[PDB]
Design a binder for this molecule. Structure first.
Ligand SMILES: NC(=O)c1ccc[n+]([C@@H]2O[C@H](COP(=O)([O-])OP(=O)([O-])OC[C@H]3O[C@@H](n4cnc5c(N)[nH+]cnc54)[C@H](O)[C@@H]3O)[C@@H](O)[C@H]2O)c1
Ligand SMILES: NC(=O)c1ccc[n+]([C@@H]2O[C@H](COP(=O)([O-])OP(=O)([O-])OC[C@H]3O[C@@H](n4cnc5c(N)[nH+]cnc54)[C@H](O)[C@@H]3O)[C@@H](O)[C@H]2O)c1
Ligand SMILES: OCc1c(F)c(F)c(F)c(F)c1F
Ligand SMILES: OCc1c(F)c(F)c(F)c(F)c1F
Ligand SMILES: [Zn+2]
Ligand SMILES: [Zn+2]
Ligand SMILES: [Zn+2]
Ligand SMILES: [Zn+2]
Lengths: 374, 374
């Protein structure tokens, strides 16, 4: 038995920015009250994890990163009521405390217990469950999935279907749900509309899936890497365009292609310039533009507010606008009922030991999602 | 009869920026096909007219400004079907052609025939109906209401109730409808919500009216001129704050007052800094901020897109989001049935010949709306 004991296990520790993960032994404390210890089964490589490595997103180091995953509960602390040992679970990088004003709001999902705004890199109680070489190691977004075992707060885990294939449904922990919800819930894409999607990685492909599910008539994918276009068309893009191919700015190209601007645009990259381009290419009176990409730390964009005064709507969201603990189990149930596909997002499946090779595939432009298996 | 003849009349001509209007004789050509010549009865002084004088809003000079008005049709050109001589009318600074993709959209109102986005200062046919001292004079937003007679395109005029008091309902041509619609139609303020309104001039007071009509529980007025607070409270503000009174930035003050951010905020001034402040003070996960104020020509704001990524919605609108020709007659009918009040906005009345004194009252901070009578 491991319950109530320290577990020594393998994890991928990030000791400093812009260095490889160190795959080595850590100690994982048992769960305290209202905490859950999870044996990980699969974890995806999201560009947001790479933002920690690159310093695009600032969080305390050293850290166990990883936030897109699925696993099996090993043990629960006193007072846990929502999961039991043996349950399949997805950790929730956006928690759902159920008590804060955001959790109580019909349209809010960015629970005030999140560790994204002012990252502390701890459990809810302000402490860490991880040690490595005698040093405390930070958590990441209350998840820390690049480890054979993690400990999460109960508000940061959802129970899912016992028959779930965890090597696929781990994508419901971030990339699929983010993109799909950004289209269907945040933008509320309408039947017959024209959409533009900037960035055709895992999250942008999931935005395309959602635009197609919502009945968009035209879905224009935009990427500087034309190798991304074939899969974008497979999942619903009707056209793809590469800004590098044009003498005009791409906002002008997209305005022309859409006979005066798109209904819905999505920034799914993480660049200030494409956030402003994406806003500009939506129709000036009734267009909607959604920011999904994570912008670089502490950098402001510049824009002319006449883009908004004419009638545009500009919004952003975390995790597709989904209330995480209510939504994740339903999204898994929908996947099991064949309501959407996840295989188009998975280009590579590697053992966890090859985490650094998986990050190199993402950085080279060669992968959509690599799933790491423990 | 004057039908088919040039009319000589008085108008307020703006020859140069940052100068008084010149009240002098102009020649007003008769209406061409699908044009309407109007004998003006009353016109309001809106801060946007002052933006023409100050070069905040660039439009070609020399010009006859004025856009908030009511009058009586003197004659109609060939093919006009929607008004007749003797009808009471309100000119529409945002037209409603009924044919463009915006007019056909259920939520658009910024008709593509507008002269706001890229001002030419002409009729739809690219020519002027005004001569002064033998020189052609520009139109303004297809309205030019600072004249005893004007000529407008048929898509820029609405027929209103024959029993309308024109010295009141002129406000439905801009300030009332803009503010009220910004709350009820654009923001869609909800019952029990907390609103913050930046700027307590005629348009911000109309925003407060709309927030109260929508059932907001708290309406916080924000102005650096504390003389504006009494009227704001009379029309529904529950609290007023002066940023000058505080050591901390007012976005932090309003976040504290609202226990974590407001539900709806409105920028009703025209400053880049207050546009960003108003966005910041709405709750980060579910808040909505609406830009109403007109920004200085060609100037960009700077902002951190993490304000949107957490969940905020940022939008703007012209004319409260109202489809102008459909909505203006209905707003007049509702005014006649006492569904809203206009007198709280009217602080001063002057004859048209005292237009410069009316602008002096606006610039000193003393007036809300001055109504000029012809
Ligand atoms: N809001 C959220 O909750 C959330 C969730 C998940 C991911 N993210 C962010 O979303 C973004 C996309 O993540 P991902 O899909 O995993 O990344 P990814 O797989 O790296 O995809 C990014 C795509 O953008 C393309 N690209 C780069 N520059 C440009 C350009 N100038 N114009 C057009 N295309 C360009 C690039 O070729 C690639 O295909 C990242 O910033 C993530 O951090 C946000
Ligand atoms: N979007 C539209 O369709 C539309 C229609 C009508 C007016 N406008 C614009 O709306 C704005 C307001 O017009 P209005 O009500 O006639 O103008 P106004 O009567 O000049 O009122 C503006 C108010 O802002 C106050 N103010 C100035 N600076 C600050 C500050 N830093 N903080 C807080 N308060 C401040 C000022 O004291 C005044 O009471 C102007 O920019 C107009 O051009 C837009
Ligand atoms: O990919 C999900 C995700 C985000 F949406 C962020 F905004 C972020 F800062 C982050 F670290 C993250 F992992
Ligand atoms: O006050 C109405 C009004 C506006 F809403 C503008 F955006 C503008 F540029 C302008 F000149 C104007 F008069
Ligand atoms: Zn919460
Ligand atoms: Zn992610
Ligand atoms: Zn139109
Ligand atoms: Zn106005």
């Amino acid at each position: 038995s491991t319950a109530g004991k320290v577990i020594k296990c393998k994890a991928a520790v990030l000791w400093e920015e812009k260095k490889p993960f160190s795959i080595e032994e850590v100690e994982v404390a048992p769960p305290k009250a209202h905490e859950v210890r999870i044996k990980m089964v699969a974890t995806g490589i999201c560009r947001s994890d790479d933002h920690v490595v690159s310093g695009t997103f600032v969080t305390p180091l050293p850290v166990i990163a990883g936030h897109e995953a699925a696993g099996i509960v090993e043990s629960i602390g006193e007072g846990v009521t929502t999961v039991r040992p043996g349950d399949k679970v997805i950790p929730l990088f956006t928690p759902q405390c159920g008590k804060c004003r955001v959790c109580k709001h019909p349209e809010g999902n960015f629970c005030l217990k999140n560790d994204l705004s002012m990252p502390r890199g701890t459990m809810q109680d302000g402490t860490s469950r991880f040690t490595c070489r005698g040093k405390p190691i930070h958590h990441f977004l209350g998840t820390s999935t690049f480890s054979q075992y993690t400990v999460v707060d109960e508000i940061s885990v959802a129970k899912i279907d016992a028959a779930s294939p965890l090597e696929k449904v781990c994508l419901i922990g971030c990339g699929f749900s983010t993109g799909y919800g950004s289209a269907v819930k945040v933008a509320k894409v309408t039947q017959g509309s024209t959409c533009a999607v900037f960035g055709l990685g895992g999250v942008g492909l999931s935005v395309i899936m959602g635009c197609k599910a919502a009945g968009a008539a035209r879905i224009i994918g935009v990427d500087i890497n034309k190798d991304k276009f074939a899969k974008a068309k497979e999942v619903g893009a009707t056209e793809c365009v590469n800004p590098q191919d044009y003498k005009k700015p791409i906002q002008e190209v997209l305005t022309e292609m859409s006979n005066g601007g798109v209904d819905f645009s999505f920034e799914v990259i993480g660049r200030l310039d494409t956030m402003v381009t994406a806003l500009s290419c939506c129709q000036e009176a009734y267009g909607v533009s959604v920011i999904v990409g994570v912008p670089p730390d502490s950098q402001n964009l510049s824009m002319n507010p006449m883009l908004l005064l004419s009638g545009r709507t500009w919004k952003g969201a975390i995790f597709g606008g989904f209330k995480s603990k209510d939504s994740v189990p339903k999204l898994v149930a929908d996947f099991m009922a064949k309501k959407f596909a996840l295989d188009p997002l998975i280009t590579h499946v590697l053992p966890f030991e090859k985490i650094n090779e998986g990050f190199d595939l993402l950085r080279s432009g060669e992968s959509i999602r690599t799933i790491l298996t423990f």
